[PDB]
Amino acid sequence: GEIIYDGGLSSKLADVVDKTTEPHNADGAVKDGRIAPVKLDLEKQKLDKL
Amino acid sequence: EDMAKIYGAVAAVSKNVNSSVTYEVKRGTHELIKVPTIPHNLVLIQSDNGK
């Protein structure tokens, strides 16, 4: 007989990244208007500029 | 045009708000090494005749 349903494109709820990501704000449907997170080189095992 | 410039300046100072800080907690951590051999310090001294 004629084929009515033979599957199709399947929508996925989630996109799970497999790579470690740097901290970030919202950039999709929600756009964070605040300043992006500040990166600080805080903990140093050896003195650099002191 | 004057209102556009005034509203632009106000929005600029409203966008000057911090969100968060990110840093690394690494002080106090040191790299380990592996010792493959136990340092025993024993020698066996035996006479020529084995007595």
Side-chain angles (χ1 to χ4, degrees), chain A residues 2-3 6 8 10 18-19 27 35 49:
Chain A
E2 226 285 316
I3 295 183
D6 190 324
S10 195
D18 61 356
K19 64 179 180 180
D27 204 13
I35 287 164
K49 300 176 332 277

Side-chain angles (χ1 to χ4, degrees), chain A residues 23 25 32-40 42-46, chain B residues 15-30:
Chain A
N25 283 343
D32 205 69
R34 278 168 315 162
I35 287 164
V38 200
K39 183 68 180 295
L40 297 144
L42 271 191
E43 279 172 1
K44 270 176 208 114
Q45 273 135 334
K46 300 297 151 262
Chain B
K15 271 191 119 279
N16 207 37
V17 171
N18 296 132
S19 46
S20 322
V21 282
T22 167
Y23 47 103
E24 276 159 49
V25 184
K26 38 157 155 283
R27 199 157 47 210
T29 72
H30 288 105

